[PDB]
Design goal:
Chain A contains 1 helix and 7 strands; from the N terminus they run E-E-E-E-E-E-E-H. Chain A is mainly β. The longest helix of chain B has 18 residues. Chain B is elongated and about 90 Å long. Classes of the chains: A mainly beta (166), B mainly alpha (128). Chain A: This is FIIR2 protein. Chain A: It comes from Pseudomonas aeruginosa.
Chain lengths: 166, 128
């Protein structure tokens, strides 16, 4: 049932960037693993050790102001932004995929201005909070400063929250 | 008793209940708690956290243990009575704990039993 992504749009603070954003990138949600090899067994196995540093990145190719004006902002996690993306599907009805991500803008990379090529600024928000929804349904909600890694409702850290006494 | 009002005499107290026969029992049971409260003052307010129950049951095990060290009691046992600690009681602030312990029995009535025999008689005197 071919889905595929058709169109994409990017918010920062309500301000739509319906225009300059030829690339989005959601934070690669990865676990830490640590290949556990140990007594009684050959071949490792790997363990949930917590997630990796979620970093997301978009790249407007316009001097956009509304994006540049969050860089290094004293209040880390002030930059909010929402990465919406419509997946078409061969049978018409498009699936809204939307990923709000309160984080810290971190860095800004304007590449080679060449007087004949889309300048293309770049950005890389060090994501703090991150909720990825599909068809208006929470699939992920990863909150580090709180410990709320919750796959569609069920909170997989509800058991470690207690043992830590949070 | 004793010469010219030498000393007091009687650990016993006016009580219909035999358990509280000794002033030592009553005074211990009272002042132990004075020391507990004057020390758990912090525990009587404060937003109940996950660790509130434990902070208190350990704080109790600290004061209680110290009293054991300096003789005051002989062993003890503190915990947070489960069959009472509930969501309802907690929403209404309340919460319960047990503090069952034993108090130093004052030695009283030493019974010096004595027999003037003639066992160690040959052991001395005769010849030797």
């Amino acid at each position: 049932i071919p889905q595929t992504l058709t169109n994409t749009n990017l918010f920062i603070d309500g301000v739509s960037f319906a225009g300059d954003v030829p690339s989005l990138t959601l934070p690669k949600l990865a676990v830490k693993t640590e290949q556990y090899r140990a007594g009684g067994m050959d071949a490792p196995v790997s363990i949930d050790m917590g997630l990796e540093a979620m970093e997301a990145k978009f790249s407007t190719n316009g001097a956009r102001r509304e994006a540049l004006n969050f860089f290094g902002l004293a209040d880390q996690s002030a930059f909010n932004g929402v990465f919406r993306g419509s997946f078409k599907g061969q049978k018409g009805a498009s699936v809204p995929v939307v990923a709000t991500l309160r984080g810290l803008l971190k860095e800004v990379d304007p590449g080679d201005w060449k007087a004949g090529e889309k300048a293309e600024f770049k950005y890389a928000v060090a994501v703090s909070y991150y909720k990825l929804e599909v068809d208006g349904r929470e699939v992920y909600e990863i909150d580090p400063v709180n410990g709320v890694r919750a796959i569609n409702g069920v909170d997989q850290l509800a058991g470690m929250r207690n043992d830590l006494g949070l | 008793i004793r010469d010219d009002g030498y000393r007091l005499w009687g650990n016993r107290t006016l009580s219909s209940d035999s358990k509280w026969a000794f002033v030592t029992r009553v005074r211990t049971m009272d002042l132990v708690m004075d020391a507990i409260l004057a020390g758990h003052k912090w525990a009587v307010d404060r937003g109940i956290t996950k660790t509130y129950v434990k902070d208190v049951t350990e704080g109790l095990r600290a004061f209680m243990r110290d009293l054991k060290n300096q003789g005051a009691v002989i062993n003890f046992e503190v915990y947070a009575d489960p069959d009472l600690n509930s969501a309802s009681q907690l929403a209404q602030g309340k919460v319960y704990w047990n503090i069952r312990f034993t108090d130093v029995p004052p030695a009283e009535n030493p019974n010096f039993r004595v027999e003037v025999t003639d066992q160690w008689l040959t052991e001395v005197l005769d010849v030797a």
